[PDB]
Design an enzyme around this catalytic site. Structure first.
Site, PDB file in Angstrom:
ATOM      1  N   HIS A  41     -11.154 -12.030  11.404  1.00  0.00           N
ATOM      2  CA  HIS A  41     -10.824 -10.739  10.736  1.00  0.00           C
ATOM      3  C   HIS A  41      -9.360 -10.744  10.269  1.00  0.00           C
ATOM      4  O   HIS A  41      -8.964  -9.769   9.606  1.00  0.00           O
ATOM      5  CB  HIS A  41     -11.177  -9.530  11.622  1.00  0.00           C
ATOM      6  CG  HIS A  41     -10.238  -9.257  12.750  1.00  0.00           C
ATOM      7  ND1 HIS A  41     -10.604  -9.440  14.074  1.00  0.00           N
ATOM      8  CD2 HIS A  41      -8.975  -8.776  12.769  1.00  0.00           C
ATOM      9  CE1 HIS A  41      -9.600  -9.098  14.859  1.00  0.00           C
ATOM     10  NE2 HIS A  41      -8.583  -8.693  14.083  1.00  0.00           N
ATOM     11  N   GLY A 143      -2.791  -5.208  16.741  1.00  0.00           N
ATOM     12  CA  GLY A 143      -2.267  -6.583  16.662  1.00  0.00           C
ATOM     13  C   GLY A 143      -2.438  -7.345  17.965  1.00  0.00           C
ATOM     14  O   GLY A 143      -1.938  -8.482  18.045  1.00  0.00           O
ATOM     15  N   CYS A 145      -5.308  -8.415  18.994  1.00  0.00           N
ATOM     16  CA  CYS A 145      -6.457  -9.319  18.708  1.00  0.00           C
ATOM     17  C   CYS A 145      -5.978 -10.774  18.721  1.00  0.00           C
ATOM     18  O   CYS A 145      -4.925 -11.054  18.116  1.00  0.00           O
ATOM     19  CB  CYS A 145      -7.117  -9.000  17.371  1.00  0.00           C
ATOM     20  SG  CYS A 145      -7.663  -7.317  17.250  1.00  0.00           S
TER      21      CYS A 145
END
Length: 305
Positions: A41, A143, A145
């Site tokens: 992503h 952020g 991830c």
């Protein structure tokens, strides 16, 4: 004595954490050998996140799109592929801090340490469990991830989790390091329901054995039970079924304390029905299900890394 929620030392994992930027988007990546692992992503704009076609987006992208900083230091991307929901960026340099590592897929109930990261930099470390509904109750901001969950085996780091998504309920969803989601969740901006979060019964029993070891014994009852009778009562309180496999895993704790597994079951049966009546166990007012039988042994036997 004493019993705390305890993470593995994070030093070995810290040395593998890097920043990955594609266009405007910035999140965390795992640098092992000459490969960087991150969520796919990363290639999405705000528009794409609603309904991404990762093949069609990844078709248009080339090696030079991906900015990778390991400290204040550029890393050259010389290749990229997609394995499910994980991006693998081949780089021109192998990580000189690469420890002994493996990728494992964990069952529900198993615990791991999370190194929460932002812009490739460690924020902190906490213990988590993979929930029966295949979510985790972590602590993650924007952020986060590409933060990973790990277990250490003396020298070897077992990577079992990469963070991909928060559900509106505030619980978290991620993949193993082959990019396959735990549970049926997708890396897309749509409302996704977690389902019924159940209590990990075998983890609760483990925590009660930890309690007795630290001289916290009041809840030890004068009744016993069978495995089937216990399960009929358990499941009414949304507790996971207890198996023969679970009884055998609790053997060492049964041996240490001299309390049969089925006696500890019976003490837990009573606690479910009568409640705690304001009492605490190891300074907790709820029954804890995020310590494994091995977590308890590790912390009570004093295993080092």
């Amino acid at each position: 004595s004493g019993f705390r929620k305890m993470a593995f030392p994070s030093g070995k994992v810290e040395g593998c954490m890097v920043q990955v930027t594609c266009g405007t988007t910035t999140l965390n990546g795992l640098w092992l050998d000459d490969v960087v692992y991150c969520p796919r992503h990363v290639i999405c704009t705000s528009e794409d996140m609603l309904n991404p076609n990762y093949e069609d987006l990844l078709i248009r992208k080339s090696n030079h799109n991906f900015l990778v900083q390991a400290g204040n230091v550029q890393l050259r991307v010389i290749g990229h592929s997609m394995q499910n929901c994980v991006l693998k960026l081949k780089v021109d340099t192998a990580n000189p801090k690469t420890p002994k590592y493996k990728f494992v897929r964990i069952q529900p109930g198993q615990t791991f340490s999370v190194l929460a990261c932002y812009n490739g930099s460690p924020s902190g470390v906490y213990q988590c469990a993979m929930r029966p509904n295949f979510t985790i109750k972590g602590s993650f901001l924007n952020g986060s991830c590409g933060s990973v969950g790990f277990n250490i085996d003396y020298d070897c780091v077992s990577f079992c989790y990469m963070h991909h998504m928060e559900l509106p309920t505030g619980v978290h969803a991620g993949t193993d390091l082959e990019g396959n989601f735990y549970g049926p969740f997708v890396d897309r901006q749509t409302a996704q329901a977690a389902g019924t979060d159940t209590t990990i019964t075998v983890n609760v029993l483990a925590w009660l054995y930890a309690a007795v070891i630290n001289g916290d014994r009041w809840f030890l009852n004068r009744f016993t039970t069978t495995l089937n009778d216990f399960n009929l009562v358990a499941m009414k309180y949304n507790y996971e079924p207890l198996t023969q496999d679970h009884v055998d895993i609790l053997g060492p704790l049964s041996a240490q304390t001299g309390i049969a597994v089925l006696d500890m079951c019976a003490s837990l049966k009573e606690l479910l029905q009568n409640g705690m009546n304001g009492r605490t166990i190891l300074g907790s007012a709820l029954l804890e299900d995020e310590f494994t039988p091995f977590d308890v042994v590790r912390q009570c036997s004093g295993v080092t890394f």
